[PDB]
Amino acid sequence: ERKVYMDYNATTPLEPEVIQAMTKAMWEAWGNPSSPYSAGRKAKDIINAARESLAKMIGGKPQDIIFTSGGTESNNLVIHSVVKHFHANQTGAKPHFITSSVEHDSIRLPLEHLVEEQVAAVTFVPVSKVSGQTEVDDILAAVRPTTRLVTIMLANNETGIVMPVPEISQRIKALNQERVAAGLPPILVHTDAAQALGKQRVDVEDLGVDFLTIVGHKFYGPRIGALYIRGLGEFTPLYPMLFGGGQERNFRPGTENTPMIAGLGKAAELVTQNCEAYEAHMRDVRDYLEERLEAEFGQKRIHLNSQFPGTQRLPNTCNFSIRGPRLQGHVVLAQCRVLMASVGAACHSDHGDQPSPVLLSYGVPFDVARNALRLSVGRSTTRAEVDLVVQDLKQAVAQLEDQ
Amino acid sequence: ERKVYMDYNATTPLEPEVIQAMTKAMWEAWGNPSSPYSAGRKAKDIINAARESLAKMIGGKPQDIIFTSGGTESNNLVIHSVVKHFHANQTGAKPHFITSSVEHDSIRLPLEHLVEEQVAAVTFVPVSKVSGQTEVDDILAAVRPTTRLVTIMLANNETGIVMPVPEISQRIKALNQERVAAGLPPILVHTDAAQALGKQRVDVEDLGVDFLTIVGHKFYGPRIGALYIRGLGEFTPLYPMLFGGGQERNFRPGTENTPMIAGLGKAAELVTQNCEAYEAHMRDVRDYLEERLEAEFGQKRIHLNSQFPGTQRLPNTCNFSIRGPRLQGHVVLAQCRVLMASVGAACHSDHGDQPSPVLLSYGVPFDVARNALRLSVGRSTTRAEVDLVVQDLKQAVAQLED
Ligand SMILES: *Cc1c(COP(=O)(O)O)cnc(C)c1O
Ligand SMILES: *Cc1c(COP(=O)(O)O)cnc(C)c1O
């Protein structure tokens, strides 16, 4: 029978209108964006409109947005810039970062690398076993005079848990007043919003952050992204990683990928127009899925890994485990004929055999983490599809148990 | 009426077959290439075929090829790796780079930044005003114990002049034998092949290089790129700029842009299939352009800037000045009704004009250089279109000088 995709957290398909915007730009807007000829001008008009659509999506200003190759580049760029700024201000002190124990690889690994190289100091703040969040008291307790950036993801890709970013920013703003009075540089705050965009409202003024990472392929756009920098070139400096021909105000040089930008901008227009519909629909079907998993297997057999009492999570995500010695997450997914899902981050799928380090940093019991499955629903996902998926998981576990 | 594009050195349109390959991958190959299910492995297979197509284009092996966002990333990545590797083996010497005085902004500016921040030393070798190349003996005379990289553009964007990259690699390999015996680390060689791909044969084995920059939008492909690394992960070290999810063997992590890669793959295919025919057609129509310009303005009025006797150049590029006090490049082009071209690196406000620094580096007399136009033709340019373009340059200059 027909397949049901429930791995939207790993990647989303392109919206038809986004593909249409890309195809048009491929044919019509092929010229160099810098040129005084009509195909270059059309390209420049594409890029300008897309920058405005992205700013509208996050409630910022187009001057605060630069286009990048993706989420990984945007996240590396923030970190890099903070090091270079600190070096500019010195040239044996090192800059210090505060982040969480559960960040995407594109934050965790540049950070670990900086410590391995003795370039930076980093505090990885654990998440509470009670809330599933970094306690903001802990982030603030970790502050030292050499601290320059707090980077805390908006929502976790594996659990859907939403982090208290607005409160972190607010506490950092009150602290920065004491610091400036003491002659210490202000601390900046980044959020990796990769998983939140298109699923719940992301507003840079409600968030209060200085930087924000945008990831197209998480909200039905193409595999590029962007970076928001508050008061870019004015209140917040940004030291490029790349050097070249002057594109993106020299913050990110290289001839602009016009068709990808047309796509990102169109994807952002859709989130602006429809975010409220998307969120509500995802929520209904994810909550339905949870209800139908407990009806079919039993409350006693299901551990809802994404659920902490009173903690916001993404509306589409359900991380759960079914009790049984034979029902490791990868092993169950291999027996499914309908469900397409994951047992973690797409880029850690190789290591599907051992529990997710992320679930383990969330305090998920080792035996429950072995059996963990991440189901993430999308814009098209229906309750009918949820019924087929649960009936697929029902047959799968029976075959692993009859073996 | 109809306009004629002669600015293909700045960018090219996409081939129809390329667009088709991209739009198909958008609909069909959208799953995460890291994911194990059905949709993932379809994307993976698009990426592997594309990397095979890239390999075949340059005469290499798919294991030696990583995908990047474009040529600027690829160029910066090579310079960055050499610095991080030097810092690795030191664990107050600095790494040293030899390059030319005529490189693209994505090579010159990252090196210039490195010398400004005191991270590296750089020798910008000038070009010979007899050959218009950076002679190999001048490159070898720049070598010092801290030298780790020579990077020399395969063909120049401005003039289309081809550099002697094979002889550079051959001599450096020979110098490297004596180095390793003296305990010194070997010198690696990079070429920015941006302007040569799809215009002439490019073969990693004939060029001898350790790195080579590939740029899709210069051969009717998308606005992404790739980097060849000889013996990647075995013989030649690459130290990444980016850190993340393990993609491109951890040399360039980040989820793979599969429709762009599918495009670049298709564009690489068309080059392998048709490089000879593209080259010959280009050379035909460019040569016709130059004979038409001379027939129409006179041999005395036209200064061909690209041209050094017995020096190879791209088949499609014609950089030339028309003699006259009013005829700065941008002034003539602004008067044209058909021709679309460029003035390359030249600038103009209203205080005055600045000729291309690149042409001045080739020794073009300042006054000639101020009048320089870069015309670069493409796969579809016809002799009939050249004729329209010469007619247009004629009416353009006529209105400027009476
Ligand atoms: C997908 C994602 C990113 C960006 O990763 P890419 O592989 O470059 O697209 C960053 N952070 C989170 C939390 C993500 O889910
Ligand atoms: C066009 C070009 C590049 C790469 O430039 P991008 O803007 O990144 O596409 C590199 N080298 C040369 C010689 C070029 O012409």
Side-chain angles (χ1 to χ4, degrees), chain B residues 377-390:
Chain B
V377 305
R379 295 177 187 181
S380 70
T381 314
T382 72
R383 289 189 169 213
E385 281 161 10
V386 165
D387 287 338
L388 290 176
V389 167
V390 176

mmCIF file with all atom_site columns, all heavy atoms in Angstrom, chain B residues 377-390:
data_model
loop_
_atom_site.group_PDB
_atom_site.id
_atom_site.type_symbol
_atom_site.label_atom_id
_atom_site.label_alt_id
_atom_site.label_comp_id
_atom_site.label_asym_id
_atom_site.label_entity_id
_atom_site.label_seq_id
_atom_site.pdbx_PDB_ins_code
_atom_site.Cartn_x
_atom_site.Cartn_y
_atom_site.Cartn_z
_atom_site.occupancy
_atom_site.B_iso_or_equiv
_atom_site.pdbx_formal_charge
_atom_site.auth_seq_id
_atom_site.auth_comp_id
_atom_site.auth_asym_id
_atom_site.auth_atom_id
_atom_site.pdbx_PDB_model_num
ATOM 1   N N   . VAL B 1 377 ? 31.817 35.618 -25.646 1.00 0.00 ? 377 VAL B N   1
ATOM 2   C CA  . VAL B 1 377 ? 30.728 34.990 -26.369 1.00 0.00 ? 377 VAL B CA  1
ATOM 3   C C   . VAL B 1 377 ? 30.464 33.581 -25.800 1.00 0.00 ? 377 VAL B C   1
ATOM 4   O O   . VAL B 1 377 ? 31.140 33.147 -24.862 1.00 0.00 ? 377 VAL B O   1
ATOM 5   C CB  . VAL B 1 377 ? 31.026 34.950 -27.898 1.00 0.00 ? 377 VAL B CB  1
ATOM 6   C CG1 . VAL B 1 377 ? 31.316 36.370 -28.391 1.00 0.00 ? 377 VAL B CG1 1
ATOM 7   C CG2 . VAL B 1 377 ? 32.170 34.023 -28.214 1.00 0.00 ? 377 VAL B CG2 1
ATOM 8   N N   . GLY B 1 378 ? 29.440 32.921 -26.314 1.00 0.00 ? 378 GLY B N   1
ATOM 9   C CA  . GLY B 1 378 ? 28.908 31.738 -25.691 1.00 0.00 ? 378 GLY B CA  1
ATOM 10  C C   . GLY B 1 378 ? 28.518 30.710 -26.712 1.00 0.00 ? 378 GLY B C   1
ATOM 11  O O   . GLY B 1 378 ? 28.869 30.830 -27.902 1.00 0.00 ? 378 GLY B O   1
ATOM 12  N N   . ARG B 1 379 ? 27.817 29.683 -26.233 1.00 0.00 ? 379 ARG B N   1
ATOM 13  C CA  . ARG B 1 379 ? 27.434 28.534 -27.046 1.00 0.00 ? 379 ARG B CA  1
ATOM 14  C C   . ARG B 1 379 ? 26.496 28.885 -28.186 1.00 0.00 ? 379 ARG B C   1
ATOM 15  O O   . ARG B 1 379 ? 26.533 28.224 -29.221 1.00 0.00 ? 379 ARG B O   1
ATOM 16  C CB  . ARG B 1 379 ? 26.774 27.446 -26.175 1.00 0.00 ? 379 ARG B CB  1
ATOM 17  C CG  . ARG B 1 379 ? 27.701 26.863 -25.178 1.00 0.00 ? 379 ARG B CG  1
ATOM 18  C CD  . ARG B 1 379 ? 27.036 25.869 -24.315 1.00 0.00 ? 379 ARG B CD  1
ATOM 19  N NE  . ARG B 1 379 ? 27.952 25.473 -23.261 1.00 0.00 ? 379 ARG B NE  1
ATOM 20  C CZ  . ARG B 1 379 ? 27.696 24.576 -22.322 1.00 0.00 ? 379 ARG B CZ  1
ATOM 21  N NH1 . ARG B 1 379 ? 26.561 23.913 -22.310 1.00 0.00 ? 379 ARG B NH1 1
ATOM 22  N NH2 . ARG B 1 379 ? 28.619 24.315 -21.430 1.00 0.00 ? 379 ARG B NH2 1
ATOM 23  N N   . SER B 1 380 ? 25.628 29.883 -27.984 1.00 0.00 ? 380 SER B N   1
ATOM 24  C CA  . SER B 1 380 ? 24.609 30.234 -29.018 1.00 0.00 ? 380 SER B CA  1
ATOM 25  C C   . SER B 1 380 ? 24.921 31.485 -29.827 1.00 0.00 ? 380 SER B C   1
ATOM 26  O O   . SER B 1 380 ? 24.165 31.833 -30.687 1.00 0.00 ? 380 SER B O   1
ATOM 27  C CB  . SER B 1 380 ? 23.260 30.463 -28.358 1.00 0.00 ? 380 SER B CB  1
ATOM 28  O OG  . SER B 1 380 ? 23.294 31.674 -27.604 1.00 0.00 ? 380 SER B OG  1
ATOM 29  N N   . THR B 1 381 ? 26.002 32.189 -29.533 1.00 0.00 ? 381 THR B N   1
ATOM 30  C CA  . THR B 1 381 ? 26.358 33.409 -30.272 1.00 0.00 ? 381 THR B CA  1
ATOM 31  C C   . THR B 1 381 ? 26.624 33.019 -31.720 1.00 0.00 ? 381 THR B C   1
ATOM 32  O O   . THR B 1 381 ? 27.286 32.002 -31.968 1.00 0.00 ? 381 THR B O   1
ATOM 33  C CB  . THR B 1 381 ? 27.570 34.088 -29.631 1.00 0.00 ? 381 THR B CB  1
ATOM 34  O OG1 . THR B 1 381 ? 27.368 34.141 -28.213 1.00 0.00 ? 381 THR B OG1 1
ATOM 35  C CG2 . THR B 1 381 ? 27.775 35.511 -30.171 1.00 0.00 ? 381 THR B CG2 1
ATOM 36  N N   . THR B 1 382 ? 26.024 33.762 -32.658 1.00 0.00 ? 382 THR B N   1
ATOM 37  C CA  . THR B 1 382 ? 26.221 33.519 -34.082 1.00 0.00 ? 382 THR B CA  1
ATOM 38  C C   . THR B 1 382 ? 27.021 34.649 -34.749 1.00 0.00 ? 382 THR B C   1
ATOM 39  O O   . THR B 1 382 ? 27.166 35.777 -34.216 1.00 0.00 ? 382 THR B O   1
ATOM 40  C CB  . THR B 1 382 ? 24.892 33.318 -34.823 1.00 0.00 ? 382 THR B CB  1
ATOM 41  O OG1 . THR B 1 382 ? 24.201 34.568 -34.929 1.00 0.00 ? 382 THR B OG1 1
ATOM 42  C CG2 . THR B 1 382 ? 24.013 32.306 -34.114 1.00 0.00 ? 382 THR B CG2 1
ATOM 43  N N   . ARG B 1 383 ? 27.561 34.354 -35.922 1.00 0.00 ? 383 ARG B N   1
ATOM 44  C CA  . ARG B 1 383 ? 28.242 35.401 -36.689 1.00 0.00 ? 383 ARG B CA  1
ATOM 45  C C   . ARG B 1 383 ? 27.306 36.564 -37.033 1.00 0.00 ? 383 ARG B C   1
ATOM 46  O O   . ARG B 1 383 ? 27.717 37.710 -37.010 1.00 0.00 ? 383 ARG B O   1
ATOM 47  C CB  . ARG B 1 383 ? 28.844 34.828 -37.955 1.00 0.00 ? 383 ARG B CB  1
ATOM 48  C CG  . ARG B 1 383 ? 30.038 33.953 -37.711 1.00 0.00 ? 383 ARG B CG  1
ATOM 49  C CD  . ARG B 1 383 ? 30.685 33.634 -39.058 1.00 0.00 ? 383 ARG B CD  1
ATOM 50  N NE  . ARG B 1 383 ? 31.994 33.004 -38.912 1.00 0.00 ? 383 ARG B NE  1
ATOM 51  C CZ  . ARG B 1 383 ? 33.004 33.184 -39.753 1.00 0.00 ? 383 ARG B CZ  1
ATOM 52  N NH1 . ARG B 1 383 ? 32.877 33.999 -40.804 1.00 0.00 ? 383 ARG B NH1 1
ATOM 53  N NH2 . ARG B 1 383 ? 34.157 32.560 -39.538 1.00 0.00 ? 383 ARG B NH2 1
ATOM 54  N N   . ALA B 1 384 ? 26.051 36.236 -37.338 1.00 0.00 ? 384 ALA B N   1
ATOM 55  C CA  . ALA B 1 384 ? 24.982 37.204 -37.600 1.00 0.00 ? 384 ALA B CA  1
ATOM 56  C C   . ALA B 1 384 ? 24.780 38.194 -36.452 1.00 0.00 ? 384 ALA B C   1
ATOM 57  O O   . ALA B 1 384 ? 24.527 39.401 -36.692 1.00 0.00 ? 384 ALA B O   1
ATOM 58  C CB  . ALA B 1 384 ? 23.651 36.459 -37.922 1.00 0.00 ? 384 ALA B CB  1
ATOM 59  N N   . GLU B 1 385 ? 24.936 37.704 -35.222 1.00 0.00 ? 385 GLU B N   1
ATOM 60  C CA  . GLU B 1 385 ? 24.806 38.529 -34.033 1.00 0.00 ? 385 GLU B CA  1
ATOM 61  C C   . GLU B 1 385 ? 26.015 39.443 -33.819 1.00 0.00 ? 385 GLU B C   1
ATOM 62  O O   . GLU B 1 385 ? 25.851 40.583 -33.389 1.00 0.00 ? 385 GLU B O   1
ATOM 63  C CB  . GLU B 1 385 ? 24.590 37.650 -32.788 1.00 0.00 ? 385 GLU B CB  1
ATOM 64  C CG  . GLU B 1 385 ? 23.165 37.152 -32.625 1.00 0.00 ? 385 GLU B CG  1
ATOM 65  C CD  . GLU B 1 385 ? 23.028 35.927 -31.689 1.00 0.00 ? 385 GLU B CD  1
ATOM 66  O OE1 . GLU B 1 385 ? 24.010 35.537 -30.994 1.00 0.00 ? 385 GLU B OE1 1
ATOM 67  O OE2 . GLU B 1 385 ? 21.911 35.359 -31.651 1.00 0.00 ? 385 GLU B OE2 1
ATOM 68  N N   . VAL B 1 386 ? 27.222 38.925 -34.075 1.00 0.00 ? 386 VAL B N   1
ATOM 69  C CA  . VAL B 1 386 ? 28.457 39.744 -34.106 1.00 0.00 ? 386 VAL B CA  1
ATOM 70  C C   . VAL B 1 386 ? 28.306 41.010 -34.974 1.00 0.00 ? 386 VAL B C   1
ATOM 71  O O   . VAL B 1 386 ? 28.738 42.129 -34.599 1.00 0.00 ? 386 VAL B O   1
ATOM 72  C CB  . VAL B 1 386 ? 29.673 38.911 -34.636 1.00 0.00 ? 386 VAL B CB  1
ATOM 73  C CG1 . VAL B 1 386 ? 30.820 39.809 -35.018 1.00 0.00 ? 386 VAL B CG1 1
ATOM 74  C CG2 . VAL B 1 386 ? 30.137 37.886 -33.604 1.00 0.00 ? 386 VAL B CG2 1
ATOM 75  N N   . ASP B 1 387 ? 27.735 40.797 -36.152 1.00 0.00 ? 387 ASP B N   1
ATOM 76  C CA  . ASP B 1 387 ? 27.518 41.818 -37.152 1.00 0.00 ? 387 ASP B CA  1
ATOM 77  C C   . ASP B 1 387 ? 26.624 42.929 -36.595 1.00 0.00 ? 387 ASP B C   1
ATOM 78  O O   . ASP B 1 387 ? 26.881 44.102 -36.861 1.00 0.00 ? 387 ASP B O   1
ATOM 79  C CB  . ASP B 1 387 ? 26.863 41.204 -38.408 1.00 0.00 ? 387 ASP B CB  1
ATOM 80  C CG  . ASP B 1 387 ? 27.849 40.335 -39.264 1.00 0.00 ? 387 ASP B CG  1
ATOM 81  O OD1 . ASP B 1 387 ? 29.079 40.541 -39.146 1.00 0.00 ? 387 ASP B OD1 1
ATOM 82  O OD2 . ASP B 1 387 ? 27.383 39.471 -40.077 1.00 0.00 ? 387 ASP B OD2 1
ATOM 83  N N   . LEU B 1 388 ? 25.584 42.536 -35.835 1.00 0.00 ? 388 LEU B N   1
ATOM 84  C CA  . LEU B 1 388 ? 24.639 43.474 -35.206 1.00 0.00 ? 388 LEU B CA  1
ATOM 85  C C   . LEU B 1 388 ? 25.319 44.258 -34.118 1.00 0.00 ? 388 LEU B C   1
ATOM 86  O O   . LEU B 1 388 ? 25.089 45.462 -33.946 1.00 0.00 ? 388 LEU B O   1
ATOM 87  C CB  . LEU B 1 388 ? 23.485 42.725 -34.561 1.00 0.00 ? 388 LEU B CB  1
ATOM 88  C CG  . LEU B 1 388 ? 22.421 42.008 -35.373 1.00 0.00 ? 388 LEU B CG  1
ATOM 89  C CD1 . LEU B 1 388 ? 21.540 41.308 -34.355 1.00 0.00 ? 388 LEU B CD1 1
ATOM 90  C CD2 . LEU B 1 388 ? 21.602 42.956 -36.243 1.00 0.00 ? 388 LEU B CD2 1
ATOM 91  N N   . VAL B 1 389 ? 26.142 43.534 -33.365 1.00 0.00 ? 389 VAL B N   1
ATOM 92  C CA  . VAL B 1 389 ? 26.925 44.092 -32.281 1.00 0.00 ? 389 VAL B CA  1
ATOM 93  C C   . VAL B 1 389 ? 27.980 45.114 -32.797 1.00 0.00 ? 389 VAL B C   1
ATOM 94  O O   . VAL B 1 389 ? 28.101 46.194 -32.238 1.00 0.00 ? 389 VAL B O   1
ATOM 95  C CB  . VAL B 1 389 ? 27.546 42.949 -31.403 1.00 0.00 ? 389 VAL B CB  1
ATOM 96  C CG1 . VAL B 1 389 ? 28.605 43.477 -30.473 1.00 0.00 ? 389 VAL B CG1 1
ATOM 97  C CG2 . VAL B 1 389 ? 26.433 42.183 -30.595 1.00 0.00 ? 389 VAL B CG2 1
ATOM 98  N N   . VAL B 1 390 ? 28.712 44.790 -33.864 1.00 0.00 ? 390 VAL B N   1
ATOM 99  C CA  . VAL B 1 390 ? 29.634 45.767 -34.519 1.00 0.00 ? 390 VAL B CA  1
ATOM 100 C C   . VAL B 1 390 ? 28.897 47.011 -35.041 1.00 0.00 ? 390 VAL B C   1
ATOM 101 O O   . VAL B 1 390 ? 29.311 48.123 -34.742 1.00 0.00 ? 390 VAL B O   1
ATOM 102 C CB  . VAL B 1 390 ? 30.487 45.100 -35.635 1.00 0.00 ? 390 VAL B CB  1
ATOM 103 C CG1 . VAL B 1 390 ? 31.366 46.131 -36.365 1.00 0.00 ? 390 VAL B CG1 1
ATOM 104 C CG2 . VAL B 1 390 ? 31.365 44.003 -35.038 1.00 0.00 ? 390 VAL B CG2 1
#
